[PDB]
Amino acid sequence: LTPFIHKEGERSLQGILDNLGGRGKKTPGTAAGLFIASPNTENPNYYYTWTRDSALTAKCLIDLFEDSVFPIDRKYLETGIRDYVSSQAILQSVSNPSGTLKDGSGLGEPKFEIDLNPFSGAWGRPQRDGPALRATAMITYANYLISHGQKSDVSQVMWPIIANDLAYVGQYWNNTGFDLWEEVDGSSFFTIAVQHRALVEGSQLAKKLGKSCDACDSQPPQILCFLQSFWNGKYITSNINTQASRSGIDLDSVLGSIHTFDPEAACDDATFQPCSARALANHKVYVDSFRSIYKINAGLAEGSAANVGRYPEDVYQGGNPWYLATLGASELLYDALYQWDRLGKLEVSETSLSFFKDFDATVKIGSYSRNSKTYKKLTQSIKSYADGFIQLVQQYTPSNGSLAEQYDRNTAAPLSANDLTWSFASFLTATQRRDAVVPPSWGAKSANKVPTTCSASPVVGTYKAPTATFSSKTKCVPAKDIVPITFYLIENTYYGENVFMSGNITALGNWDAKKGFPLTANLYTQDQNLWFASVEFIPAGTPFEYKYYKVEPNGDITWEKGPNRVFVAPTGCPVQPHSNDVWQF
Amino acid sequence: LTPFIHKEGERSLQGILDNLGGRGKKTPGTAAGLFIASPNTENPNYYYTWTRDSALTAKCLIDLFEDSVFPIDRKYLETGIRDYVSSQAILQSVSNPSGTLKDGSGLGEPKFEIDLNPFSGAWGRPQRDGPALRATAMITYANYLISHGQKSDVSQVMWPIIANDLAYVGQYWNNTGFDLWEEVDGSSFFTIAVQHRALVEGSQLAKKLGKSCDACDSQPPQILCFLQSFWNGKYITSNINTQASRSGIDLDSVLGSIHTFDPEAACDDATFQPCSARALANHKVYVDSFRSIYKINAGLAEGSAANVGRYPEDVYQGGNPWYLATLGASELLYDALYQWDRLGKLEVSETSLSFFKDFDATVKIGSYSRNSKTYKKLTQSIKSYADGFIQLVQQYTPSNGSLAEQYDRNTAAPLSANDLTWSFASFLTATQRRDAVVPPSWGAKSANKVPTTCSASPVVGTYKAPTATFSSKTKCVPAKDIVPITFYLIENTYYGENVFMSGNITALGNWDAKKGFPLTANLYTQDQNLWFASVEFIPAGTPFEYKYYKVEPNGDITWEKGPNRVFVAPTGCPVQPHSNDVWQF
Amino acid sequence: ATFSSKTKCVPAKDIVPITFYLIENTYYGENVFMSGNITALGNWDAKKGFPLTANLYTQDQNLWFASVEFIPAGTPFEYKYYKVEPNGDITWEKGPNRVFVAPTGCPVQPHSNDVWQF
Numbered sequence A, B: 001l002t003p004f005i006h007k008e009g010e011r012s013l014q015g016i017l018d019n020l021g022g023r024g025k026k027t028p029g030t031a032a033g034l035f036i037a038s039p040n041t042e043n044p045n046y047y048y049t050w051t052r053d054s055a056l057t058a059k060c061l062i063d064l065f066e067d068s069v070f071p072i073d074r075k076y077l078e079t080g081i082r083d084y085v086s087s088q089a090i091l092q093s094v095s096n097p098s099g100t101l102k103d104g105s106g107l108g109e110p111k112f113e114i115d116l117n118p119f120s121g122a123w124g125r126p127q128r129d130g131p132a133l134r135a136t137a138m139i140t141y142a143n144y145l146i147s148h149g150q151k152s153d154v155s156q157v158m159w160p161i162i163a164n165d166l167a168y169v170g171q172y173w174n175n176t177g178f179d180l181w182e183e184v185d186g187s188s189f190f191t192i193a194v195q196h197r198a199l200v201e202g203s204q205l206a207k208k209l210g211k212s213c214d215a216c217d218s219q220p221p222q223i224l225c226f227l228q229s230f231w232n233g234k235y236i237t238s239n240i241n242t243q244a245s246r247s248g249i250d251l252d253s254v255l256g257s258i259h260t261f262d263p264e265a266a267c268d269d270a271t272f273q274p275c276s277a278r279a280l281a282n283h284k285v286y287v288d289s290f291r292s293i294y295k296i297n298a299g300l301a302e303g304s305a306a307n308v309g310r311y312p313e314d315v316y317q318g319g320n321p322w323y324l325a326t327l328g329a330s331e332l333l334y335d336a337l338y339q340w341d342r343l344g345k346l347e348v349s350e351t352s353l354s355f356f357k358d359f360d361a362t363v364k365i366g367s368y369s370r371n372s373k374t375y376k377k378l379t380q381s382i383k384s385y386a387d388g389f390i391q392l393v394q395q396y397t398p399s400n401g402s403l404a405e406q407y408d409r410n411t412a413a414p415l416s417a418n419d420l421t422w423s424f425a426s427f428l429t430a431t432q433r434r435d436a437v438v439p440p441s442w443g444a445k446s447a448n449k450v451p452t453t454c455s456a457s458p459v460v461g462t463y464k465a466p467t468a469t470f471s472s473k474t475k476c477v478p479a480k481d482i483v484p485i486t487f488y489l490i491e492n493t494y495y496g497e498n499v500f501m502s503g504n505i506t507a508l509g510n511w512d513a514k515k516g517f518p519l520t521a522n523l524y525t526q527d528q529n530l531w532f533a534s535v536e537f538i539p540a541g542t543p544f545e546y547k548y549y550k551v552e553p554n555g556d557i558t559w560e561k562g563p564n565r566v567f568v569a570p571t572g573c574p575v576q577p578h579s580n581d582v583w584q585f
Numbered sequence C: 001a002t003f004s005s006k007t008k009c010v011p012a013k014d015i016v017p018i019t020f021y022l023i024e025n026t027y028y029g030e031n032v033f034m035s036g037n038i039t040a041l042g043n044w045d046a047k048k049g050f051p052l053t054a055n056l057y058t059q060d061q062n063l064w065f066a067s068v069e070f071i072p073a074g075t076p077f078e079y080k081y082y083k084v085e086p087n088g089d090i091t092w093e094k095g096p097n098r099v100f101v102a103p104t105g106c107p108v109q110p111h112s113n114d115v116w117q118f
């Protein structure tokens, strides 16, 4: 495995930087510090920035920057991290279909346009994990800055951003939202778990800076209390509080543990540590659910690595293995191995008995120290099993090293979005854990006491527009075919009227009222009769004419009066191009 | 030292049992399970039961009962503990000058009569440490019962009592009250520290029983936050929130650490563990404050044990060494020694530097493992220093083994109350720690995280009269000279009128209006115009006549009309003898 | 903050008011006084002792206080607290007499924070 991990590891770091706005070669017109999810523009279109993908990848690069094996430009990496932080200052102020910064709701928006404008269309919103992952990425870089004498930089630029995200989590954790696959509307294990961690970490940074974080003081025990409801007795039910019906067997559960891994923590069931009996039992159930149903898993018995997906009921693009799933499966095992090595022992219990019997059919319930025959046999066997997952990825990685979103359940051909940022991140992170490189401890050993009774009392936050940003020389790879522009219109309507825009270019339908671009009413209110559209497929420099109309509920087309409006799409590095318009009578 | 610890240790266990109502030979007319503070009846009169003395002594006997060296009747000890628990069920319902059970306020009353009646006179009330110490004693016996299959006994008899005390602490911790010496009205280190511990322990028992304790969930971090205000930078200021002015150097601070000692905890400054730099620095300051001022400390230099008192400004009975102070001084050191031995190391820091320089003038700041030359030198020297305190007690213990409250600053003669229950308890507890016998861990390692900001939000409790009690064969040592009777009177008055009672026996003044017994107005209200008196020096069986009168604000004596009222003091084992009276017109 | 000035004061002579603050829990009808060995404190005559006010006595702080005014600058004195019980009895605090020395020159809020001696 060793040469392939070196080769694909260099390739994976390159794949991340290529997708980072500023200098990334595959990000034309993207603002500095914004990660694209993939350079795919069509079938599917992933040429946007997601708060989740971007925060998980930032965490990956920050850990890399302070600890790792192959050639690395530290200066280039720190500038990218700084540009990431600056870009997020700006996005926190953007009003969007989830809401505004004023009351916090805007912060739960899943994705944005590459030029810092909001996305207008319908989507699985809100996704409440986002602020939590971003605070965790940011606190991690902040603790590095404090260590190297730059504490004034942390309090001036970084604390204003982190305080908004911590406040969001303190206020909204006990509301439903969409899961990380953007499909199921309810309460998600992964989301609650990362929310719990983010607040605990906020507390620690707040004390280093001499600041308050009331949310960080009051909420963590009650978030932990709720997180216990996901354990069903046999595995982790991934979504609850929902009308949805699937089994709940889902990678979501494995990712929750992976991304709340604490190297200094014991095998704690309360916080679901990777070496905990709950996480191991869930691992077996998760993996086994794919053995039967993918043709490329034929003959791969219990005790052997298999190719795994999001959830067994999945039909998205056929319902296939995901590279980040197969890699995540290994990473949970590598985390477990590290913890047992640190502790000097492992425990086999009733809950974990089936997991361990896949490596030793003989095994009995008991405690086993580092010296013992069972400890050696189980750990050496679990190690080979974990490597087996990386071996399957090796069989199915193309010669050019590209990691797509998916590989095919029947043929293993790569498919869906190419060069998925999070796929590359997932490779580095799994292979780091195999080599015993682990991130800073988040303090799980002091955030594991479950209350006597669950009783939720979230706190309303105070939110303030960030103002300061880091100084950087980064500009952007010039814009080409995609320059998203946002059009804001004031127009009072009656129930059943819908507002559209038309114009003399392809993205506006070339004056065909059947092909006009719809405006959303998500921010229409008695206080501001507002409609808006974000039109994306407009090349840099395009001059165009446009005009608003309504589709009346009888089918009639009612055009605004007056002359056509004119606009010129910018060139180079566009920042929130838009027009504020009032209906022409 | 060894023979004296065996001899005085047997004597001390005997001294405790002698003072325990039920079978204790020095407790005539005292109800089963009530500890008297001392058999002294005059100069001073300590023939009452205090919630503090009784709870600290119960903790001592419970620890003894599950772990200790000399002859011990375990059956006799368990019955006494059971009788203690039952007696406290009854007392929680007694209305008194601090208030009623209905709103919790009654629970802060410092002392009661030996026959379960309230004490009527003015006193340093409330003392808010009481409920906390009783809950801690009780939870400790409860965890023993659960271990030996008697969990239904814990939930039926014990939880109702403990829930009232935990609720009291959750509601009233952020109010002022009198300190443990019954003098200073403010906020006391000892009181906050034991309040913090009691709630943490309640949480653990509540989960074992499947019960709620909302107070135990919400309050501990904010109690811990407030406890940080007692550290002044050099020592622990014993009382704050007060008009009082003393230095704040006081045994109170040492007792706070001793009685929140956790053998499984590290040298934590946040919870002031005995081996913490804060507790050691305070130890030196506390001890040094007495070296100059007591004549019996002449020539006892730094590095040698000295005789110590309550606080350096003390004038009570002359202001003298207390046996429990001298012993407490040693116990803090023995606790420190145990913790360093468990951890494998000790640390010398700037805060602790003066403490350690008394045993090694050379010592430098650093960390020192068990193997090192400094660790051996410091620990062997600290050990001899601690023993030096027990050696001074040996010089000043009488041949009959009696431990009074005090011994004289000039002559070392024993004085004030003889056979102080808490003095005997303090001997067992210090000598146990010397022999490395330690109590169950209370979980300080999971209750040491200080919030980002202090912001108090106590919760209003729900209080319910306990009903169930343990079955016992214990009765009492028959009543002799002291049978306290309570007289409750309904009588409406105008401002300046005071109610008294007179009668034909010595305790009622033999019909002399100058010598009548005053009734208190502490429970007089627009809703119940109530006055009451608890008259104590009435021998068993006494028949008497009595009559109420007022001293008018002009000096006139106004007698109630009608015939004299008649009463007969009971014999044997009196339970709350009293009369409910209405003014005779 | 205050303004900077060179002003001091005309030195004190016959009137140096001192405030005595005492913590002491009582029952209804008890009044606290102070006595001592100078004229303003009544020369140990319990009929002539100085009364303390209960205006700031509360369940939260059992506080009594007196401001005694006709005490010349520099006077050294002994004092002791007592209660007049509602039956007329005089109950003295125990322990030694407390000692104080009235300041000279320009006194700023001379006072004593005291706790009843048992």
Ligand SMILES: *[C@@H]1O[C@H](CO)[C@@H](O[C@@H]2O[C@H](CO)[C@@H](O[C@@H]3O[C@H](CO)[C@@H](O)[C@H](O)[C@@H]3O)[C@H](O)[C@H]2NC(C)=O)[C@H](O)[C@H]1NC(C)=O
Pocket (backbone or CB within 6 Å): A173, A174, A175, A176, A186, A187, A225, A226, A229, A240, A241, A454, A455, A456
């Ligand atoms: C907001 O927080 C509260 C309190 O943690 C959450 O309420 C709890 O939700 C869980 C899961 O639905 C409930 O558990 C269920 O209880 C039923 C009935 O006993 C049982 O049959 C199920 O198997 C499951 O255990 C739990 O009772 C409930 N606790 C309460 C109300 O105190 C709530 O779900 C959270 N909501 C969101 C949107 O975050």
Ligand SMILES: *[C@@H]1O[C@H](CO)[C@@H](O[C@@H]2O[C@H](CO)[C@@H](O[C@@H]3O[C@H](CO)[C@@H](O)[C@H](O)[C@@H]3O)[C@H](O)[C@H]2NC(C)=O)[C@H](O)[C@H]1NC(C)=O
Pocket (backbone or CB within 6 Å): B173, B174, B175, B176, B186, B187, B225, B226, B229, B240, B241, B454, B455, B456
């Ligand atoms: C009830 O709980 C609150 C909150 O813990 C307590 O308030 C805090 O009291 C302390 C001690 O008096 C205050 O500290 C002091 O602050 C001043 C001014 O900055 C400083 O000069 C002193 O040396 C000392 O540090 C602290 O500020 C205060 N915190 C608040 C109000 O948030 C309160 O004392 C508790 N009361 C009782 C009766 O338990």
Ligand SMILES: *[C@@H]1O[C@H](CO)[C@@H](O[C@@H]2O[C@H](CO)[C@@H](O)[C@H](O)[C@H]2NC(C)=O)[C@H](O)[C@H]1NC(C)=O
Pocket (backbone or CB within 6 Å): A398, A400, A401, A402, A404, A414, A415, A416, A417, A418
């Ligand atoms: C690297 O290899 C990948 C996978 O083989 C290539 O991606 C495919 O490119 C072909 C070209 O016609 C398309 O038909 C497929 O749809 C692509 N797959 C996916 C998942 O998008 C990729 O083109 C190669 N990269 C370079 C730079 O040559």
Ligand SMILES: *[C@@H]1O[C@H](CO)[C@@H](O[C@@H]2O[C@H](CO)[C@@H](O)[C@H](O)[C@H]2NC(C)=O)[C@H](O)[C@H]1NC(C)=O
Pocket (backbone or CB within 6 Å): B398, B400, B401, B402, B404, B414, B415, B416, B417, B418
């Ligand atoms: C045990 O010894 C103590 C102390 O010497 C005795 O207590 C003293 O008794 C004398 C007897 O007249 C009194 O003057 C003292 O006031 C007592 N001291 C105190 C502190 O109370 C005690 O009497 C002896 N006990 C027995 C049972 O003989």
Ligand SMILES: *[C@@H]1O[C@H](CO)[C@@H](O)[C@H](O)[C@H]1NC(C)=O
Pocket (backbone or CB within 6 Å): A504, A505, A543, A544, A545, A566
């Ligand atoms: C669309 O309108 C713009 C602005 O009037 C004009 O310059 C441009 O040539 C037009 N483009 C077409 C017809 O494609």
Ligand SMILES: *[C@@H]1O[C@H](CO)[C@@H](O)[C@H](O)[C@H]1NC(C)=O
Pocket (backbone or CB within 6 Å): B504, B505, B543, B544, B545, B566
């Ligand atoms: C006091 O009164 C009682 C009841 O009338 C009477 O029996 C008793 O002898 C009297 N005691 C005296 C005068 O000591």
Ligand SMILES: *[C@@H]1O[C@H](CO)[C@@H](O)[C@H](O)[C@H]1NC(C)=O
Pocket (backbone or CB within 6 Å): C037, C038, C076, C077, C078, C099
């Ligand atoms: C009063 O007491 C003080 C202090 O003890 C003493 O110095 C002074 O002489 C006394 N004054 C009298 C008796 O006038």
